[PDB]
């Protein structure tokens, strides 16, 4: 603190955010989304182009937050060692919360799998519902996920050895190795024999493997913004926190898929 011209710079390593308008606009978009989804499902509106505006405005509101998160870190230069630790602790406490939604859905499976009622004749997958064979396309998705978990390790170990062509190629291969998962799993939802309304079995199978679908669109977006921000020279060899959060998010989804494949697809009796 006894450096000579110390008064001209901030005396504590924490970020004082400037005034931003986006919290109000996110809430005003969620107001419209909640009321429009509550109303269109019981009449009262009819036209289905207000719900789509509500979802589009929500997603643009998150994108407009993340712009001001990027400019405050690569241009203004206010991300010290403490603020990075705070961001890492923060992201870990959202990954932990997004795991515990799947715990309730797994417990909604074992409360019916072990002990089925009398209305269904006591049997899993019940009579008249042909399940999905796990020696078909649900193998291809698993091997594509295990390969995508291996390709990003070649991308995080090429930004530390200062090789640029070798970070762009790996991220490109991973981005095409998550689009194929969505394309395969939308083909496994059009060639099925049972819907969301055909049992308690068809209702919990499309509600634990449908949240995963929404969670893996987010990796395609987060990897596009990690390829595009590396192409335009924003990443240094020691200060990159966009890659570290996308790597921790991918591996949790791989481990979750390896528990959605032994409990949902293989174990039926």
């Amino acid at each position: 603190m006894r450096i000579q011209n110390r008064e001209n710079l901030q005396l504590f390593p924490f970020h004082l955010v400037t005034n931003s308008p986006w919290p109000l606009t996110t809430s005003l978009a969620l107001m419209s989304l909640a009321l429009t989804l509550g109303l269109t499902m019981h009449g009262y509106i009819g036209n289905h182009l207000w719900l789509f505006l509500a979802i589009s405005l929500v997603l643009s509101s998150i994108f407009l937050w993340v712009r001001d998160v990027v400019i405050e870190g690569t241009y203004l230069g206010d991300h010290t060692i403490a603020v990075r630790k705070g961001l890492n602790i923060g992201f870990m406490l959202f990954v932990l919360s997004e795991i515990l939604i799947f715990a309730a859905l797994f417990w909604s499976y074992f409360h019916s799998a072990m002990g089925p009622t009398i209305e269904i004749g006591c049997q899993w997958p019940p009579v008249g519902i042909t399940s999905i064979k796990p020696t078909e396309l649900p193998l291809l998705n698993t091997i594509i996920l295990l390969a995508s978990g291996a390709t990003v390790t070649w991308a995080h170990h090429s930004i530390l050895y200062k090789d640029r062509q070798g970070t762009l190629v790996g991220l490109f291969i991973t981005t095409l190795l998550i689009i194929l998962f969505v394309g395969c799993q939308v083909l496994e939802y059009t060639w099925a024999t049972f819907t969301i309304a055909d049992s308690v079995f068809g209702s919990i199978f499309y509600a634990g493997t449908g949240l995963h679908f929404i969670h893996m669109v987010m990796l395609i977006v987060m990897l596009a913004i990690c390829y595009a921000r590396m192409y335009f020279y924003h990443f240094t060899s020691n200060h990159h926190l966009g890659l570290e959060t996308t790597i921790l998010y991918l591996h949790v989804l791989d481990i979750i898929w390896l528990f959605l494949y032994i409990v949902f697809y293989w174990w039926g009796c």
Binding site: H48, I120, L137, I144, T153, L160, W191, T195, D198, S199
Partner: protein
């Protein structure tokens, strides 16, 4: 006041931890390329070639399950097509993903 001098023992500690990231990431970078080009690509290739034949032989047992009459479709149990609230998109007897070639609702 007198300026604080810099300890030259905490200076080499920072400059060693930045040159030992360049080192220890020379063999791992070439290893994880070979784990991604020799035991990751033939796996996807073999399983894609297998599943193409497997699920293209099943693509000709579903093209004939469309001109079947309503009296030859498999019998419908209870709990089978729960329509107790009509869906708000289009007709009320169709979900998001709905092909007529595999699925039907017999009245």
């Amino acid at each position: 006041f007198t300026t604080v001098k810099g300890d030259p023992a905490k200076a080499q500690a920072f400059k060693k931890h930045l040159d030992d990231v360049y080192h220890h990431s020379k063999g791992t970078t070439a290893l994880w390329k070979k784990i991604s080009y020799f035991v990751a690509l033939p796996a996807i290739a073999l399983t894609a070639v297998n599943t193409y034949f497997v699920e293209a032989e099943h693509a000709e047992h579903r093209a004939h399950n469309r001109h079947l009459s309503d009296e030859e479709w498999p019998k419908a149990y209870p709990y089978q097509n729960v329509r107790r609230v009509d869906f708000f998109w289009g007709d009320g007897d169709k979900t998001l993903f709905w092909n007529p070639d595999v699925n039907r609702h017999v009245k």
